Amino acid sequence: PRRRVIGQRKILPDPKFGSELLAKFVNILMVDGKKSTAESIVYSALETLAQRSGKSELEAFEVALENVRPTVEVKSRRVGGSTYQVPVEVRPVRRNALAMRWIVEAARKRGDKSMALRLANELSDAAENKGTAVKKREDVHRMAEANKAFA
Amino acid sequence: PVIKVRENEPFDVALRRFKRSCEKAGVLAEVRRREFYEKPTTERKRAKASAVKRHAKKLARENARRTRLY
Amino acid sequence: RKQVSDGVAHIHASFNNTIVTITDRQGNALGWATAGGSGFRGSRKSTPFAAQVAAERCADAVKEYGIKNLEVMVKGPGPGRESTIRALNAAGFRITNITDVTPIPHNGCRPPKKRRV
RNA sequence: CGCGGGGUGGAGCAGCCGGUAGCUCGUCGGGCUCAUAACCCGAAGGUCGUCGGUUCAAAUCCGGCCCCCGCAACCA
RNA sequence: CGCGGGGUGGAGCAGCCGGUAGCUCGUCGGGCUCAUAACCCGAAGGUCGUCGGUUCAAAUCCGGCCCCCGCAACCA
RNA sequence: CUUGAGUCUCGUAGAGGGGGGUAGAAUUCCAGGUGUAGCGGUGAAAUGCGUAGAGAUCUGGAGGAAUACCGGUGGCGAAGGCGGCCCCCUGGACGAAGACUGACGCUCAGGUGCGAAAGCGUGGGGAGCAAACAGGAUUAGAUACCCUGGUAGUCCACGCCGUAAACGAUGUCGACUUGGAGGUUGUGCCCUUGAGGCGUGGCUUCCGGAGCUAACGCGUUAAGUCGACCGCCUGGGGAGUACGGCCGCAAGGUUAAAACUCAAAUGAAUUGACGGGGGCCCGCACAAGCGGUGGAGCAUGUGGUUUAAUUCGAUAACGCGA
RNA sequence: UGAGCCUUGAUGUGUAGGAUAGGUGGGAGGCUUUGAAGUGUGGACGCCAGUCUGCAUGGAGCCGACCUUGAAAUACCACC
Secondary structure, eight states, rough: OSSSSOOOOOOOOTTOOHHHHHHHHHHHHBBBTBBBHHHHHHHHHHHHHHHHSSSOOOHHHHHHTTTTSSEEEEEEEEOOOOEEEEEEOOOOHHHHHHHHHHHHHHHHHHOOSSSSHHHHHHHHHHHHOOSSSHHHHHHHHHHHHHTTTTT | OBOOTTTTTTHHHHHHHHHHHHHTTTTTHHHHHHSSSSOHHHHHHHHHHHHHHHHHHHHHHHHHHHHOOO | OOOSSEEEEEEEOOOEEEEEHHHEETTTTTEETTTTTOOOTTTTSSHHHHHHHHHHHHHHHHHTOOOEEEEEEEEEESSTTHHHHHHHHHTOEEEEEEEEOOOSSSSSSSOOOOOOO
């Protein structure tokens, strides 16, 4: 907004692992304020993922996230007659969010049956460095690279 | 703006110096001026207008200054 | 090809496009590169970054000649002016002289008419 | 009839040694875009005309056939 | 009468081999638009003048007829 | 007679004029070298130029036009205008003292001359720029703006044209009336003790007093206070046009009506509103996000059409009065 | 500057692999004081693994069927 920047609201860490990031992810996943179901789904995804990759539940998730975080995104300035997409260094708070969102989107897209399962699959893909979220990230990066002349 | 890098001089410093020299020359400005033909009248007008502006800045503003703002 | 230690970099910096040309000290061109050639078109090639990359390309091209010392001659107004020379420096030549060589007439030919935009 | 070019991904131009199997525009997805095009990324389209053989590499070298070219010569 | 162009979607200009059946403005539809002219998306309008035949491709090659053109020649 | 007007003496500054030389930078072209795939251009493109070697880069040559910096609300000129440097011919201005002439002055209808740019004639020249023209864009169209080219013309000589917002939109000459800050160019004195100090002349930029003015503003360079002479105006349109004359190669110029027609037309300033003017600021206004509507079926209101009637109203109206 | 030729040299990565296998026939040891393996490197090619070769140093050994393989050694060889 114009007038005043405001302090981001307080977020509680999830009961299972005691993590803020996890909680955020769960929130993102959630729909129609049905938090509980969403959190259950998330947990399920984690468990399966853990089983698959070993490690811990949280650590694996973190790793997955890491492979889909964008260093740089673009924005539309359009000062000229035609529009110029300009790259911008995307901040720590935002980058984490974006990756999560992308992952969620991928999960939603995916052709597997249960939501949780789909999510798990997505996570696995991210970890391995294939899939939808990763592709999206690449695209984002690619665009930035293309428009690197603007800065 | 001919320049020679001195012995044990940094590159950046040299570049800066060059830039300064260029500025002094007013080469870029000159180039800009000669990009397109300015009608004599237009040239005259700008010069006089600019002068007028300068005069305004010098005297009127000085007068204003005498009186405090708050 | 005969290797040469010292040469000139001519940097033709226009408003629309930068052209870097490395030559020997006598005048004979060794290699060249351009912002338009480096994979930039229109809005993109009239930028400092583009110029820099052109410069880099040029440098790469004159690797076989084995050029260590380099004097730079900068021509025209543009973005590709400071940037290009920086790029050249990075590429790793000892920059010896940095000259400006913009053609300034002493009121000679009539320029074209002013654009109405 | 004889003699020089050779025969391909919707069309076209594909790196002297047979192991590289394409690039442009095109159609679809997406990215950006006010737009459209340009621009970025990726994706479906083969026989290498054909019949064979020298060889694990063959369309990729050769024997014949069908055509496209080009040849220049002929015609009671 | 003889001889050259050919005959279409409300009008007009439609890719040498008969298998492609259009594009402009127009009317409707809806939001853009301070307003419409809009940009953009989609939608109704055929016979291919006609009578036949070579052929599964025909209006699309040919035989005749009706007109539109153009022809240049004629006229007691 | 000497105070106006002029002449003489010595200096002064000046893009004042005419003529003839020359210098350096840059553009263009030509010839050649190096070199290799782009160049160019725009908001974005394309036309255009490029592998027949462009663009870039260096060497040599040709030719034309204009004179960076100095350079300034600086200077000179009656105005138009005048800008590298040098020479030749040449007009004016100002100051310093004296000396002389002795009203010789001011203004000026007709008349005469000079008079930007474009334009015309004849002969030269032609680099760059560029009306016309052509193509490429843009667009509903684009006979424009933008891009790529491009011929008259711009340049020179000698003629003609005789007009421009030829403006300070302010005729010329003279006298008189408070001030300040400069610029420029002389000149007198003063220890120039220093770039200074005190004057006194010319031209000039800005601000402002009295006064003047419709106001805006002008204000010792008047638009103040007066005198001399001339030019010009008499509502807007029709019209600076027609006819006639004079001038012109022509383009056209100049002089200059009438009918008819409207009750306005204008100037300055004022309050608003508006601006694809400018500054500052705000709002789920955008941006950042989440969920919808627009497609489906149904509910519901409206438009329409239908009906004997489909009650009337709302149209920031349309699950609204209800 | 193009381009032939008597001649004597070099040149040749399907994967199995000692690793830059053109093919046929005569063949089990060719070269080494008109100087063998290891070292220093000047110039070439290149699929970056290496290959051929000049001059220096060194002075008494490297390479064979080999294990594999559609085809066996550049152990000598002539034909191209």
